[PDB]
Design an enzyme around this catalytic site. Structure first.
Site, PDB file in Angstrom:
ATOM      1  CE  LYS A 147      -3.951  -2.105   0.134  1.00 43.36           C
ATOM      2  NZ  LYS A 147      -4.759  -2.196  -1.113  1.00 43.36           N
ATOM      3  CD  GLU A 189      -9.988   3.383   0.283  1.00 42.11           C
ATOM      4  OE1 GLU A 189     -10.014   4.631   0.190  1.00 42.11           O
ATOM      5  OE2 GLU A 189      -9.107   2.659  -0.260  1.00 42.11           O
ATOM      6  CB  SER A 226       0.169  -8.331  -0.922  1.00 42.74           C
ATOM      7  OG  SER A 226      -0.640  -9.221  -0.182  1.00 42.74           O
TER       8      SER A 226
HETATM    9  C1  LIG Z   1      -8.144  -2.988   1.564  1.00 41.34           C
HETATM   10  C2  LIG Z   1      -6.976  -2.968   2.197  1.00 41.34           C
HETATM   11  N1  LIG Z   1      -5.990  -3.832   1.972  1.00 41.34           N
HETATM   12  C3  LIG Z   1      -6.038  -4.814   0.917  1.00 41.34           C
HETATM   13  C4  LIG Z   1      -4.830  -5.711   0.822  1.00 41.34           C
HETATM   14  C5  LIG Z   1      -4.703  -6.603  -0.348  1.00 41.34           C
HETATM   15  C6  LIG Z   1      -5.767  -6.603  -1.427  1.00 41.34           C
HETATM   16  O1  LIG Z   1      -5.861  -5.320  -2.038  1.00 41.34           O
HETATM   17  P1  LIG Z   1      -5.393  -5.073  -3.549  1.00 41.34           P
HETATM   18  O2  LIG Z   1      -5.805  -3.658  -3.827  1.00 41.34           O
HETATM   19  O3  LIG Z   1      -6.138  -6.084  -4.368  1.00 41.34           O
HETATM   20  O4  LIG Z   1      -3.911  -5.308  -3.553  1.00 41.34           O
HETATM   21  C7  LIG Z   1      -3.604  -7.448  -0.437  1.00 41.34           C
HETATM   22  N2  LIG Z   1      -2.646  -7.486   0.504  1.00 41.34           N
HETATM   23  C8  LIG Z   1      -2.650  -6.717   1.613  1.00 41.34           C
HETATM   24  C9  LIG Z   1      -1.530  -6.838   2.603  1.00 41.34           C
HETATM   25  C10 LIG Z   1      -3.764  -5.775   1.844  1.00 41.34           C
HETATM   26  O5  LIG Z   1      -3.799  -4.987   2.946  1.00 41.34           O
HETATM   27  C11 LIG Z   1      -6.692  -1.939   3.178  1.00 41.34           C
HETATM   28  O6  LIG Z   1      -5.784  -2.132   4.012  1.00 41.34           O
HETATM   29  O7  LIG Z   1      -7.351  -0.885   3.165  1.00 41.34           O
END
Ligand SMILES: C=C(NCc1c(COP(=O)(O)O)cnc(C)c1O)C(=O)O
Ligand SMILES: C=C(NCc1c(COP(=O)(O)O)cnc(C)c1O)C(=O)O
Lengths: 399, 257, 399, 248
Positions: free
Chosen positions: C93, C115, C382
């Protein structure tokens, strides 16, 4: 090798600092570990294995970040943060653990034991043991299990057994005592993965050798980013591993000041502190001749700090030697000073440090005021603050 | 010349028995009661008394001894109370050695502690966390003040280290069966004594968590001394009469004809 | 480029994936952000600033780690983990956040809103706002505040205000709705830092451009370590940012299979899932024409997953386009499958993943069995699992 | 030739007043009661009725409307119930437009929804999340089935987008939001003679009168829902007060 001790583990002469103040029952396994380390530290295949894990598993090198928004709180000095907080597991502890765990496998040991206070060494050890398929038992003081509970749960998920120690102060020194007792009984099959730069030879030297990488990287990085060697390099001091790790590469740079910051708790005047160099004196403790907090009879005085990682009444013998030599200055930092710095770093740079590391940051701010405008200060940001979030949120009235 | 404890072992060996070596920690349950307890050991037939110095972080002590040393420290016990205990033992016709972790000795001063221990009638020093490798000051103080130096050996001890530890010892070598605390209820102990006898004629004391007459008798077949600690503390906790009875049973155990 | 949408935000021409399904009240600020992005993406000063922060602050590059102890659980295939878990804040993120936060400052906006579901985007946003001195407000569903409470406390320590959203399903979609309403009211001063690759133009393209760095690093790293391009690249898919980030650099390599794994919750047959591609259909939701879970009248169906990050009934429009084109395959992974993989990664490699990322690892294990011995599979790891330790310890009976 | 709602605004403009435009959501508190309420609006003097289609994720709806649409959905309301509502309004002598988020229209089919809306006697469509940029299918459906297309403009609207939105609208422009409302109405009047409706959280007679000084239509919704929640008589009384407001 210029800064290494003799074959008995002594710094500064035949009676100096360090050595082996252990029972004869431990000497076979201590000599076994010493011999194994002497063999493997000069094996390229070992160093290659360690390097490969450092790069691809642990994510080294860690970066050096100029925290420009701290400058005005540090007399307009330039604070550079060595970001060990970004390592796998969230601290410098993983550096030492990868080395020692690789060594445990080389020796044919099937069981690894460790002490932990903050839970970062415990988590790192559990991590390496999962990775290498070793059985793992972590000893942790009962007070520490309660205030670093996030790390207890992590250790358990990683497959480690966690044993809460109820003896003495129920903190790091008491965890160490229990781990020692385990090792004495289980020396044949068990490797003791000691997490700081203290203990009997070979641990102070071995732990320092595996943490040297911090300083080696920092010395290159600071010359690249600032154009010169720093005016100072600073770190917090528990038993002394992160400090000695970053300091070591600068020891022969005579213009580089070195400052270690120790936990002063409620204050050095209160008797609720861990300010070993400020208030302690020389003695034999946890395997080494070094400084410790002790009374008139030589009984260990129980330490106190808001930081579980600095709540230890002893310190490593290399630090005692460097203190005696006049090469490093060691200075107290209180709970309040550390929490002010914790908060400042969150607010200004968006980095949530370990409460341990916040002591170093707090010290750097004061040193900045002393040295003044444009002075270059490298700070070892030893770990991240996820484990401390509950404590800090409570401190700042945020639940 | 000869070791301070030499005559005791020669005297025991002439009467076809082992020496009974009894441990109590100074200040448990308080300082006066502990001195009365140590006097009782002399009266009940202990050949040698190990006067324990309570230490804040006693890594090699078992649970029974650890809780007792904690209690002594809560009571305010001091290192000089151990010297007073040795005096009282010497006055009562007994023979005392001190068992201590090393830091209390460093803090007191190694030469000064050796001087004052010898002045109190103390015969030697048992050093569970001091190996000969670090014992340069102690060796000098030991020779100067005519005190025996009892180092420990373990089943894990290498041939080299065992030989070096026996060579460095005067009086007796403490062989113990590994983990911390008095033994409580394996062929490790006779094997270890056997290895010491192969390189030297120094007496060997054995600690195995002894609690009964039968166990003391087993050990007396191969060992020159039987060391008892945990069980004496447990006995004293119940009462001074219970200690006298137990010590009397162990004194019968070490004799075998 | 070849893969970008038209000026209206449409992928694939006239089908029309993406676009802007927003009220006229938002169009002034949407056009403002679009223009500012187009200007700043080609400004060397902006790219230098972003780069400097990625290196020294966030710790890029993240390493690529061959998880050899997973191999026997994956048909003897070779699983390479792209370690986004080691980034500052503990996820991918931060990549998108540093870009958008720098952009907010360039635009002269004084307030940032976001959000969050898992709390990782919330924490990253708070982090950047601390760093840059911006007011910060994070919207988080009430169910998410409870199950990701560690991240709520981090956000608060970082100086962010957190608003618990109690409407609808009290999860990510509902947080998005509230943040949208805030933006509508406060457009003149407020930047909306949207955390995934969905929304109206320019967000899908902009979020992807800031996450592209993952794939660009991975593509170089895998060729270096394995000597060739992978047989597959895989990731979990919430809204789609980490997946599109790692996929993008491989789009034009025709032998590289791309597989996105979506959350199937209790199972796709149960009506308690977030399996958008498996069970959803085309529709307009949260600013874009893409796939979503919807009933016969077009009412959004509430998603469910053990993972807060994947608990979203929508998906980004670029993914809809790639699915239509046959370039990426999207497959369901259940709560149970994900947790099995969670546990396995802990025990085998000493890495505690995010439950989100565990879905990708689980999928990779199955893909390994399909592709067979020696197949090279890059998995986007991720995030890390700090936030999920309680959930996982409870799952595995470790209390 | 001309818009469907054109004669209503001309009739108002001839009687020196603004049109009262009343919003209620279908299925609140249930489907029969909502239809009876919409009929009551016709009787109580609403010139145009906005029939709301409840949507699961209504981004632009305030709390009063959001909770009511949530309740309608819990009760099982369907998109067809809206078309039944339009029919009942048209039979009672009222004039109905539908307000809906776009996905329900896509799902139904844009052409089919236009066809069926027109067959029920519906006069047009208000589209809060459909900008002209995405409205190609709707423009075609609107022209074919003779339905007005009411797009929204905002205070934030750029000059270019305001012009484009007004040009794309038939019937009226929904000007949604201190001095912002008259200023926004002023900017629409500078480029077009199309009627402008104003929605401002109107609760009272005085507020409707203020708006009628510059706007061709006064849009009321939140207050009508609040009134219906207390009771059907309370809705009649309020609607009658607002009817008096627009005539000044
Ligand atoms: C929606 C949120 N997170 C999604 C998330 C995801 C899925 O979100 P993507 O936008 O598909 O990458 C994958 N891995 C981690 C560590 C995440 O925190 C959030 O923290 O607001
Ligand atoms: C004692 C433990 N930690 C100490 C610690 C320290 C102090 O220990 P040193 O050995 O002095 O580096 C500094 N920083 C962090 C993040 C730490 O966790 C432990 O986790 O077992």
């Amino acid at each position: 090798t210029s800064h290494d001790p003799d074959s008995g583990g002594h710094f500064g002469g035949p009676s100096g600092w360090g050595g082996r103040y252990v029972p004869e029952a431990l000497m076979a396994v201590i000599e076994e570990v010493t011999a194994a380390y002497q063999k493997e530290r000069v094996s390229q295949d070992f160093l290659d294995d360690l390097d490969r894990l450092q790069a691809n598993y642990a994510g080294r090198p860690s970066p050096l970040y100029e925290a420009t928004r701290l400058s005005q709180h540090a007399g307009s000095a330039r604070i550079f943060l060595k970001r060990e907080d970004l390592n796998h597991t969230g601290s410098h502890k993983i550096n030492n653990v990868l080395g020692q765990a690789l060594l445990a496998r080389r020796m044919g040991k099937t069981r690894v034991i460790a002490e932990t206070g903050a839970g970062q060494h415990g988590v790192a050890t559990a991590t390496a043991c999962a990775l290498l398929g070793l059985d793992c038992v972590i000893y942790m003081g009962g007070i520490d299990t309660a205030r670093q509970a996030l790390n207890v749960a992590r250790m358990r998920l990683l497959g480690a057994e966690v044993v809460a120690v109820q003896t003495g102060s129920k903190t790091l020194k008491d965890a160490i005592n229990e781990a020692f007792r385990d090792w004495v009984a289980n020396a044949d099959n068990t490797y003791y993965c000691f997490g700081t730069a203290a203990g009997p030879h070979p641990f102070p030297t071995m732990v320092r050798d595996f943490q040297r990488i911090i300083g080696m990287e920092a010395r290159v990085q600071i010359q690249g980013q600032a154009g010169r060697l720093p005016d100072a390099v600073v770190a917090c001091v528990g038993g002394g591993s992160n400090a000695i790790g970053i300091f070591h590469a600068f020891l022969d740079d005579p213009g580089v000041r070195l400052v270690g910051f120790e936990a002063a708790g409620d204050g050095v005047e209160t008797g609720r502190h861990a300010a070993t160099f400020t208030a302690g004196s020389p003695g034999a403790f946890h395997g080494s001749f070094s400084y410790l907090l002790q009374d008139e009879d030589g009984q260990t005085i129980e330490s106190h700090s808001i930081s579980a990682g600095l709540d230890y009444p002893g310190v490593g013998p290399e630090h005692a030697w460097l203190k005696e030599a006049g090469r490093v200055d060691y200075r107290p930092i209180t709970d309040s000073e550390a929490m002010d710095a914790f908060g400042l770093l969150c607010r200004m740079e968006g980095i949530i440090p370990a409460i341990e590391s916040a002591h170093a940051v707090a010290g750097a701010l004061k040193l900045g005021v002393e040295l003044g405008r444009g002075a270059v200060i490298v700070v070892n940001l030893s770990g991240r603050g996820d484990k401390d979030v509950e404590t800090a949120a409570k401190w700042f009235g945020l639940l | 010349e000869a070791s301070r404890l030499g005559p005791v072992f020669d005297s025991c060996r002439a009467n076809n028995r082992a020496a009974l070596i009894g441990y109590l920690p100074t200040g448990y349950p308080d300082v006066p009661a502990s001195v009365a307890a140590m006097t009782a050991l002399v009266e009940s037939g202990c050949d040698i008394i190990e006067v324990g110095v309570p230490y804040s972080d006693p890594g090699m002590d078992g649970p029974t001894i650890a809780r007792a040393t904690e209690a002594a420290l809560r009571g305010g016990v001091r290192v000089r109370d151990t010297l007073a205990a040795v005096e009282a033992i010497s006055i009562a016709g007994g023979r005392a050695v001190v068992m201590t972790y090393w830091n209390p000795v460093l803090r007191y001063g190694v030469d000064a502690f050796a001087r004052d221990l010898a002045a109190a009638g103390g015969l030697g020093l048992i050093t569970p966390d001091l190996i000969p490798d670090e014992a340069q000051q102690w060796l000098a103080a030991s020779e100067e003040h005519r005190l025996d130096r009892i180092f420990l050996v373990a089943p894990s001890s290498t041939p080299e280290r065992l030989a070096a530890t026996v060579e460095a010892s005067r009086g007796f070598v403490y062989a113990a069966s590994t983990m911390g605390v008095t033994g409580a209820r394996s062929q490790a102990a006779p094997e270890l004594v056997g290895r010491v006898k192969a390189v030297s004629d120094i007496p060997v004391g054995v600690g195995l968590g002894v609690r009964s007459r039968a166990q003391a008798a087993q050990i007396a077949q191969y060992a020159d001394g039987v060391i008892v600690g945990s069980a004496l503390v447990t006995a004293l906790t119940e009462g001074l009469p219970r200690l006298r009875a137990l010590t009397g049973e162990l004194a019968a155990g070490v004799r075998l004809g």
